[PDB]
Amino acid sequence: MQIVKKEKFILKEYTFENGRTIPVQMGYETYGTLNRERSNVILICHYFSATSHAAGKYTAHDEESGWWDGLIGPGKAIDTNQYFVICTDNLCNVQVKNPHVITTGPKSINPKTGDEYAMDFPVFTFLDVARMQCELIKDMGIARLHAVMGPSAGGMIAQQWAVHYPHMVERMIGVITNPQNPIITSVNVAQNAIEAIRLDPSWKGGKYGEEQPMKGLQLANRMMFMNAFDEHFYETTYPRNSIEVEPYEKVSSLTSFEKEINKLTYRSIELVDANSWMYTAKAVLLHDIAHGFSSLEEALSNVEANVLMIPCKQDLLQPSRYNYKMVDLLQKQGKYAEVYEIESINGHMAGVFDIHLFEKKVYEFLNRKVSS
Amino acid sequence: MQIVKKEKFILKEYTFENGRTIPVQMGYETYGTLNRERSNVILICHYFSATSHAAGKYTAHDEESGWWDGLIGPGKAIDTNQYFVICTDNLCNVQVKNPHVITTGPKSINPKTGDEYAMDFPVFTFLDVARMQCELIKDMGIARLHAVMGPSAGGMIAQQWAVHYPHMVERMIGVITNPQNPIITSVNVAQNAIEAIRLDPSWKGGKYGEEQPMKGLQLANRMMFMNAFDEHFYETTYPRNSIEVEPYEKVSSLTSFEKEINKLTYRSIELVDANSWMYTAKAVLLHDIAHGFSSLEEALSNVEANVLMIPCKQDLLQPSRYNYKMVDLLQKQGKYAEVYEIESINGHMAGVFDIHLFEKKVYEFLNRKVSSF
Amino acid sequence: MQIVKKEKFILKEYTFENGRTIPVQMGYETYGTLNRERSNVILICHYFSATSHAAGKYTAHDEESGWWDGLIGPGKAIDTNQYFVICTDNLCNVQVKNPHVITTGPKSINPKTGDEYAMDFPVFTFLDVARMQCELIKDMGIARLHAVMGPSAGGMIAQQWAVHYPHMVERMIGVITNPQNPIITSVNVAQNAIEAIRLDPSWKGGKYGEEQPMKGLQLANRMMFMNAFDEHFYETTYPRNSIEVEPYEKVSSLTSFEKEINKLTYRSIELVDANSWMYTAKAVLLHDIAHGFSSLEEALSNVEANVLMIPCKQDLLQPSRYNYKMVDLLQKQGKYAEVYEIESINGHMAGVFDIHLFEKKVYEFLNRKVSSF
Amino acid sequence: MQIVKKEKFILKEYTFENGRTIPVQMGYETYGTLNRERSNVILICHYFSATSHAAGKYTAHDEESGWWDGLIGPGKAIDTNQYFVICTDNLCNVQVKNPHVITTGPKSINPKTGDEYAMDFPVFTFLDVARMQCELIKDMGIARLHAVMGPSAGGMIAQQWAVHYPHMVERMIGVITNPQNPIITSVNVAQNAIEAIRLDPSWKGGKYGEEQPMKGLQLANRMMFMNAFDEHFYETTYPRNSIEVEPYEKVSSLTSFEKEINKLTYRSIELVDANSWMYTAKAVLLHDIAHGFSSLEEALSNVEANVLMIPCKQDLLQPSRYNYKMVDLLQKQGKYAEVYEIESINGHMAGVFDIHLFEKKVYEFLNRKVSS
């Protein structure tokens, strides 16, 4: 497909769910063509550490394609010959040093003061993201989405669309996600990550400038990486060396696997900002479609979209049992909802790397008609 | 209390008791906290010209609170530190121009045509309202109501709950209401009001758009207002001026009492929709819990809730003798049922304005144990 | 009784209380025989929709007798072997098409123009009727009335006699009436009726000629009818049908009670004139014996007749509490005055249909001696 | 003025005050000219033994003029240059053998049976006469009378017009008459006359054919003649002869005055019918404007005409005190009423013979305006 052009949406003022009001900017990109009646729109929401680059390439010499490139494009499951596909940068995008990212977050200058917001930036939830995207959708004269979809945090944003803009969502597909962030993941990955970043003395109250608290940030990144796959993936990809003697002789002497994983996890945080990681982890920890309602049932009663949940059985971050519970509750309200569970040694990351496992189901779901 | 949030419930298709099927929506709002067992829910139903706003405020600068605020809240008779309280907007809500109201009615757009339903809107009953509320309650994951209650039309809905969802209602409290709309009220206030609106040429067959038939509507509103209190209330509140001569000079010169009452009744139809008023008047005139059944006795045989009826002895719209009849029938079936009759110069409106006369009874009743299974 | 002869009384010019001067006529009829002293005269005044025909028949093949026939005649409570009884047609008599009625009103020709007065007719009160009757009584050579009496509007006229011709009235009996038309009735039944007729486009500003505005008039008539009895009367006489489904299907489908009541109320406006109805409703709404004076107390200070008030406890049009107030004021002035309250499911209409409830009292009162001079 | 032409009005059926229904015919005559708007009509009603011939002549050689000829004619008090004047024959007119009289009475043939009504004829009152005249007035398209007037019985008829057709009568003039026939006249002239006629064996139950009961009829006529003037009129017109001896010698021998009066009273009954005299005397005896009302006051309350009563002080048949009482009652009802009393040795007959005594008052009354 065509080289993708990065775009920028501005909002002079946006009011957060907690009442705070500030200007916001938001990168986005689109693939395919918006039809005459604007009825072919699919909105993709990106996961924790990703960006709006769901598909394609910015230049012809890009080493890689966008993170869901296997699903999106001409003749693929999300066929850009039929649909107009949008993807946006989340608020507090963690890759603030990525040259293609356009976001507002703790590194943004506060126009009232000339300085970085830092920890004065407002707490945001994935409802906040949904509402901001919705301003872009309306500004483009679009009234209904044919589908809203995404993996993990992207799936959280998508669930918020389904609950808070019921009229606007024909279909909702939540890959490797859940209606409420599990307690285990909330503490063990979100809370522990926030506290690792704050414990690093280089954090300096959140006023660290460009000198990132890298040790804390690497620790945060490592906790997430070490639950992103099946147990057995680590066992065979970073195998124990039973011969090596140096790790047995000083506490600080690392094993071969520790060094491999150190190198990967340091690499993936080079473009990342620590305060932004914190805010994003806070949004994940707060993720709860039932917040502001008296039960999960009442919140789900708002949903009018057809719903497809695609969990992975080996997913340690997002246990699939809560997909079944949600879908059961939707069906008892007489709504169309299904779970399509996949299996993979990639665990959670199956939702991003193992497209072949569910592309056909996505395709079929996107073509299935919705009750008026 | 915490500031109240309006919510919205939708059904893609609802089938009315007369068989018509259309999409419907319904505003609602809640107060207090649902307990783990979901055993502390009280559903409040609103009266003719009101809305879901039974208590509290939507902003801290609201001049007024909701219409039963004195009964509902922290430490009050319907104690929101203990109960999760729900209230919903009725179909064809008359305050259709009020932006806090979410309803389906003659002003709503028919999706099949893009035009307003107008007089193509289906006839509804208070049983239709109870069926919609029940979908919402079920969809919220609630199996049983600790109580259902309301004044007047609100009590009509509560009675339809008690009759038609007997495994779900522990307690029913019906304030200034009756099991069957009295004939006197059905003609003098519902039929006459409907006909007054139709008679106005501005009504234009129901297609008046944004220009309400104000003469017909004011007349409809004045008929209800003039039965809302005891007779002596009007005699002392808008007393006769025995000196003014101008009313004695032309048929069209109004007395001062006519002027005061015209002013009040005009003011209260400012946000109101005429067609909506007709459909709601029609619902009131059709109100009959025996409809469906072979008799009132049969309709009541199904009730298993503890029942409390609170009429006002001076109510001209809802004569209290039929509360006694109903309670008597329920007692002879071996059910728990009582009348607690209040007295007030306010007549019918005692049920909304003289909370002090019955709040202690409500409280006691909400705490009495369920007699049946 | 002997067949009754209609008579006619004319005034070439009469000046109304509002100062308008026009020629007027007034039908009347009499029963019994005037004694030599002319001391046995009882004047009967008729109610809203009636006529001078208080008793007997105009031909021996009349289906019905006059509206108080059970009280008036040989050996009856108002015994025509003993009393000379008179009754007259009121101004703006509504039964203007009835050929036995002789009245002046909006259908009458204005002699200055040759056209009907229509809404140029002057506003009248029941004091205007009393002033006309008095001219007739005087012109017949009668100085004093043994009694003046009537039900409802008829009682309003009788009260105006007692207040304004105190040297002429020995006894006043006011049945199902009040000294001041209650505010509730003045608005709910007089103002609303007047406005219902004006709202009908057929009314054509009062110039409808021979084509009466039947929708407006029927609505006016139904409002009065629905307050004429006790509430329970309507509940048992036009009971709800809990089986019929058609009313539940269209706004415009009537219930069976609506059909029965429509039929009755249509029938009774067949001989009736709309403008006439308005003027008479206006008279009722203006009724106030204190008008003129500084207070009700002052108006009543002038009464020297023995006074008997006969309200009905279930009367919704004329609440009996104001009969007690009036009688109390008269007693504290040292006058002879009493309330004899009846009870009946017939409500207001007990005063015309349940003669048996008070005929014995009337008789006793007509025979008690005058207390004042 | 012009020779008068006698006319005839027919009524196919007339219903009497007592309910009897029979065809009727009624002679009348008119003088002057009916104006465009028919507002100049004066109706004259004739007295006991008279006819419609109030004025003028039937032929140029008539020995006499009509009985009120002095009041009626060009330039007279009842000016035929301005007014259209009507006079009719009363029901049961006593002059049935007068060639100019057209009446219905006891000598009329009953069309149902081919015979004279005789005593089967209905009792009539002067209201009956008023109602019949009114049928003629309406048949001529006349709506109001400018005046209705007459002497004695004619005045009774006029009072009935005033009471029973109030709308139609602007002015009422009653000469030598009364609202109720006095008891004295009712017995002494009406009753005694009826009984004298019935006592005559020639009456034969009222079936006497043409052989009139002349003795009874002369006796009836004489009683009326002997009260028609002042006492002193008889004393000087038929004076006592103090020389005559024959009356002193047999009971049946008559005095000179008895013979004079015998000759006059026999002459005046030559054209008269006895049953008709009876019915007319009965109407006089029944004359009571209060009949069918509860008092004289109530009856008078109907009168809307201006009223002029012209009694004669010496009138023995119609004592003038009752004119004053009537007029007093009318004035207390706020009506325009007056008594204009005349004096004359002619007594009752002054109303017919002494026109000069009140012509000027009649004239003035006819010109005085009436309140609408």
Query: Among partner residues B5, B8, B140, which is closest to A297 by beta-carbon distance?
Result: B140
Of B20, B323, B74, give the one whose Cα is nearest residue B179.
B323
Q: CB pairs under 8 A, 24+ apart, for D260-263? A: D261/D222, D261/D225, D261/D226, D262/D218
User: D339 - beta bridge partners?
Assistant: D309
CA dist B178 and C62 (Å) reads 45
Cα(B171)–Cα(A315) distance, integer angstroms: 47
Residue B322 and residue C360: Cα distance in Å, rounded? Answer: 35
Q: Is A116 helix (H, G, I), strand (E, B) or coil?
A: strand
CATH number for the domain whose boundaries are C2-373: 3.40.50.1820
Fill in the DSSP letter of residue A324.
Answer: H
The alpha-helical segments, DSSP class H, found in chain B are: 126-139, 153-164, 183-185, 192-199, 214-225, 231-237, 256-267, 274-286, 296-301, 321-332, 350-353, 359-367
Give the Å distances, CA to CA, from D331 to A273, C254, D109, D262, D301. Answer: 119, 62, 46, 45, 10
Distance CA C310, CA C154 (A): 13
Q: Which of B123, B182, B188 sits opposite C251 (nearest CB)?
A: B123
d(CA A353, CA D108): 136
Residues A270, A56: Cα–Cα separation, whole Å: 23
- Residue C218, chain D, CB below 8 Å: the answer is no
- Closest by Cα among D140, D132, D133 to D34: D140
What is the length of chain D? 372
Asked if residues A193 and A222 have their Cβ atoms less than 8 Å apart, the reply is no
Q: What is the DSSP string of A289-319?
A: TTTTSS-HHHHHHT--SEEEEE-BTT-SSS-
CA dihedral in degrees (C360, C365, C366, C372; nearest 10)? 180
Tokens of A84: 């107009």
Do chains A and B touch, with touching meaning 3 or more CB–CB pairs less than 8 Å apart?
yes
Helix B214-225 to helix C192-199 angle (10° resolution) is 160
Contact D296, D329 (CB under 8 A): yes
**Distance from D295 to chain C by nearest Cα, in Å?**
7
Chain breaks in chain A (C to N over 2.5 A) after: none
Contacts of C13 (CB under 8 A, 6+ apart): C21, C22, C23
Contact in structure between A261 and A85 (CB atoms under 8 Å): no
Residue D43's closest CA among D29, D59, D61, D62?
Answer: D29
- The domain spans of chain C are 2-373
d(CA C246, CA C269): 28
In C112-126, which positions are buried (b, 16+ CB within 10 angstroms) versus exposed (e)?
eeeebbbbebbbbbb
- Side-chain-side CA neighbours of residue D205 (13 Å): 3
The H or E element that residue A193 is part of is: helix A192-199
Q: Test B136 with A166 for CB contact under 8 angstroms.
A: no
What angle is formed at CA A93 by the lines to CA A89 and CA A96, rounded to 5 degrees?
110
Nearest CA among D224, D354, D280 for reference residue D101: D280
Q: Give the Cα separation of B198 and B218 in Å (integer).
A: 12
Q: What is the rounded distance in angstroms from the CA atom of residue D114 to the CA atom of residue A317?
A: 133
Give me the CATH code for the D2-372 domain, please.
3.40.50.1820
Residues of B annotated as part of the active site: 152, 315, 348
A271-280 burial code (b ≥16 CB/10 A, e <16): ebbbbbbbbb
Token duo for residue B167: 């495994």
Residues in chain B that come right before a backbone break, where C and next N are over 2.5 Å apart: none
C-beta neighbour count of C109 within 10 angstroms: 10
Q: Which helix (H) or strand (E) holds B42?
A: strand B41-44
The CA distance from D55 to B127, in Å, is 95
Instruction: Report H helices in chain D.
Output: 126-139, 153-164, 183-185, 192-199, 214-225, 231-237, 256-267, 274-286, 296-301, 321-332, 350-353, 359-367
Coil, strand or helix: which one is A343?
A: coil
Q: Is residue B222 classed as helix, strand or coil in its secondary structure? A: helix
CA distance B83 to B79: 6
How many Cβ pairs closer than 8 A exist between chain A and B?
A: 33
The packing angle between helices D153-164 and D274-286, to 10°, is 50
Question: Per the structure block, which two tokens stand in for B108?
Answer: 């709503």
Interchain CB contact of C160 with B (< 8 Å): no
Q: Tokens for C281, please give them.
A: 């409703």
End-to-end CA distance of chain C: 34
H-helix or E-strand containing A351?
helix A350-353
- Residue D312 is given by DSSP the state B
CB B14 within 8 A of CB B23: yes
User: Half-sphere exposure of residue B347, counting CA atoms within 13 Å on the CB side?
Assistant: 18
* Helix, strand, or coil (residue B269): coil
| Biggest alpha carbon–alpha carbon distance for chain D | 71
Sheet-wide strand order for A21-31: A7-15, A21-31, A84-88, A41-44, A147-151, A171-175, A306-310, A337-339
Strands D115-116 and D72-73: unpaired
Chain C: closest CA distance from residue D288 (Å): 16
* Single-letter code of the amino acid located at C181: N
> Quick one: which H or E segment has residue B44?
strand B41-44
Please answer whether residues C176 and C151 qualify as being in contact, where contact means their C-beta atoms are separated by less than 8 angstroms: yes
SS3 for chain C is CCCCCCEEEEEEEEECCCCCEEEEEEEEEEECCCCCCCCCEEEECCCCCCCCCCCCCCCCCCCCCCCCCCCEECCCCEECCCCEEEEECCCCCCCCCCCCCCCCCCCCECCCCCCECHHHCCCCCHHHHHHHHHHHHHHCCCCCECEEEEECHHHHHHHHHHHHCCCCECEEEEECCCCECCHHHHHHHHHHHHHHHHHCHHHHHHCCCCCCCHHHHHHHHHHHHCCCCCHHHHHHHCCCCCCCCHHHCCCCCCCHHHHHHHHHHHHCCCCCCHHHHHHHHHHHHHCECCCCCCCHHHHHHCCCCEEEEECECCCCCCCCHHHHHHHHHHHHCCCCEEECCECCCCHHHHHHHCHHHCHHHHHHHHHCCCCCC
Q: How far is B216 from chain C (nearest CA, A)?
A: 8
- Going by C-alpha positions, the residue among C283, C166, C170, C184 that lies closest to residue C227 is C184
> In 3D, which of A182, A206, A176, A185 has the Cα closest to residue A46?
A176
SS3 sequence of A49-109: CCCCCCCCCCCCCCCCCCCCCCCEECCCCEECCCCEEEEECCCCCCCCCCCCCCCCCCCCE
Q: From CA D31, how far away is CA D84, in angstroms rounded?
A: 6
CA distance D208 to D220: 17
- Spatial CA neighbour of B161 closest among B138, B181, B140: B138
Instruction: Retrieve residue A269's tokens.
Output: 């945080």
Answer for the pair A56, A2: CB distance below 8 angstroms, yes or no. yes
- Judge contact between B346 and B233, C-beta under 8 A: yes
Q: Which amino acid is at C351?
A: G
Report residue B264 CA to chain centroid gap.
20
Resolution in A: 2.4
Q: Which backbone phi and psi does A153 adopt, to 5 degrees?
A: -55, -30
- Distances in Å between the alpha carbon of C343 and those of A53, A229, B183, C324? 88, 90, 21, 15
> In which region does residue A4 sit, left (phi positive, over 0), alpha (psi from -120 to 50) or beta (all else)?
beta
Burial of D23 (0-12, 13-18, 19+ CB in 10 A): middle
CA angle C221, C225, C226 (to 5 degrees): 120
Which residue in chain B has the smallest CA separation from C317? B231
State the Cα–Cα distance between residues A65 and A60, nearest whole angstrom.
Answer: 10
Pair D200, D213: CB distance under 8 Å: yes
**Of D9, D30, D38, residue with least CA distance to D131:** D9
Nearest-angstrom CA–CA distance, D64 and D49: 16
Q: Pick from A166, A297, A371: which is nearest to B10 by CB?
A: A166
DSSP D111: T
Sign for the pseudo-dihedral over CA of A289, A293, A296, A297? negative
Tell me the three state secondary structure of residue B145.
strand
Let me know: does B366 contact B353? Beta carbons within 8 Å. Answer: no
Rounded Cα–Cα distance for residues C98 and C96 (Å): 5
| CB of A135 closer than 8 Å to CB of A11 | yes
DSSP state of A145: B
Spatial distance between the Cα atoms of D134 and D86, rounded to a whole number of angstroms:
12
Residue showing tokens 């598909």:
A55
The alpha carbon torsion through C58, C62, C64, C66 (nearest 10 deg) reads 0
Sheet holding D41-44, edge to edge: D7-15, D21-31, D84-88, D41-44, D147-151, D171-175, D306-310, D337-339
Residues forming a β-bridge with D175:
D151, D310
Q: Which amino acid is at C51?
A: T
Report the distance separating Cα B227 and Cα B176, nearest Å: 13
CB nearest to B216's CB, from C194, C199, C251: C199
How does D47-82 read in b/e, with b if 16+ C-beta sit within 10 Å?
Answer: bbbbbbbbbbbbeeeeeebbbbbbbbbeebbbbbeb
Provide φ and ψ at C224, rounded to 5°.
Answer: -70, -45
- Token pair of D244, please? 């005559």
Cβ–Cβ gap B140/A298 under 8 Å = yes
Q: Do D333 and C30 touch (CB under 8 A)?
A: no
**Strand duo D147-151 + D171-175: pairing:** parallel
**Biggest distance spanned by C-alpha atoms of chain B:** 71
A291 reaches B (C-beta below 8 A): no
For residue C52, give both structure tokens.
Answer: 């001078």
C34 near D294, Cβ under 8 Å?
yes
Residue located via tokens 């990703």: A50
Could you give the maximum distance between any two Cα atoms of chain A, in Å? 71
Is A301's CB within 8 Å of B139's CB? yes
Is D333 near chain C, with CB under 8 Å?
yes
Nearest Cα neighbor of C253 from C271, C269, C241 is C241
Contact (Cβ atoms closer than 8 angstroms) between residue A55 and residue A32 = no
Q: Using CA atoms, how far apart are residues B311 and B328, in angstroms rounded to an integer?
A: 15
Contact flag D298-C139 (C-beta cutoff 8 Å)? yes
Q: Which two tokens stand for residue A174?
A: 């939540």
